[model samples]
Target: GLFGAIAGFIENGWEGMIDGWYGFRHQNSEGTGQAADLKSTQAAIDQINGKLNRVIEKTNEKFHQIEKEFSEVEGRIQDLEKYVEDTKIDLWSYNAELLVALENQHTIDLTDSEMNKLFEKTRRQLRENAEEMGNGCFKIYHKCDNACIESIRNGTYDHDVYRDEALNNRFQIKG
Candidate 1:
């Protein structure tokens, strides 16, 4: 039918539109009347629809398969970004702990419970020189020192010996 051909043109592209026109001409040549044969035109539309429907379905299956994997891959990238957050937490929290323990007046030979108590006592004591710069970030300057003025009075503050301690405070060590 003429109506069926136009409908097919709307549904499909040039390839299927050409098929519709071919089917229309075929029906016209076969049938006695000027009007298109309904049965033959329907058959041609069904043929093109069957083939293209299969192609679209197959392509959609491939897309869904890859889509799921890409979602999981994106989740992995998000988790690794949190690993950077964990690394910053490690640095800041440990440095703050060490700073707190250094500034406190406590003996080196204190018991484990005593040390734990000292740590608990000093917890949440955000120092004047240290600042929490929001979201796993810290702004800390000035060395955690034990009376630098004493070394200055002793006239060894400029040299390395003034910074030295009784084998207790170690800022860094080389392998």
Candidate 2:
């Protein structure tokens, strides 16, 4: 963006220099029209000044445009980031349920702050379902699916595989 503005100034500078040099050389020519030529040369200088001023004006306008564009892009990026976090966090709990539902394989990829947020939500209702591993990153649960099999047995319908037990929610009490 700056390059175009700089190039315009360079072009105008060179044009002015060349014109001044040529006008100086013209002054050495023997003629009664010398005054006319000098006047015309000053006119050319006036024109160059006008062009330079316009270039400065154009450069200033472009900077404002760039700044506006920069602000808009920055604002949009922040907005997009907010949308992503909003959408992803909502889905996080849904998948978190599925992981616990499976009773065997599960993990929640949430950071500390996010974990707190999820925990805050849980506190509002609810987590033997969720535990913190020694590592900072993994959200875990204790092993097994016994409660799941038991749930089926309580209902009128029963499955031979789950007759004794089903996989899930095995709460424990220990000192």
* Per-residue lDDT of model 1, residues 1-175, tens digit only: 1222223222332353443322111111223211232334454456556645654564323332212122345566667666776787799899979854653322221222332332222223323333444322223233424333232222233433423441223433677
How far out, in Å, is residue 63 in model 1?
Answer: 39
TM-score, predicted candidate 2 vs. hidden true structure: 0.17
Worst 10 residues of 1 by lDDT: 21-30
Flag clash pairs in model 2. Answer: 145-166, 145-167, 145-168, 146-168, 149-166
Highest TM-score against the true fold, candidate: 1
Q: Model 2 Cα displacement at 63 (Å)?
A: 13
Which numbered prediction scores highest in lDDT against the true structure?
Answer: 1
**Model 2 over residues 1-175: C-alpha lDDT tens digits?**
1222122212322244443322211111132111112333454455556645654564323232112122345566677666776787789878868745642221111122233433243322212344333222223232223443222222322233432332243244555
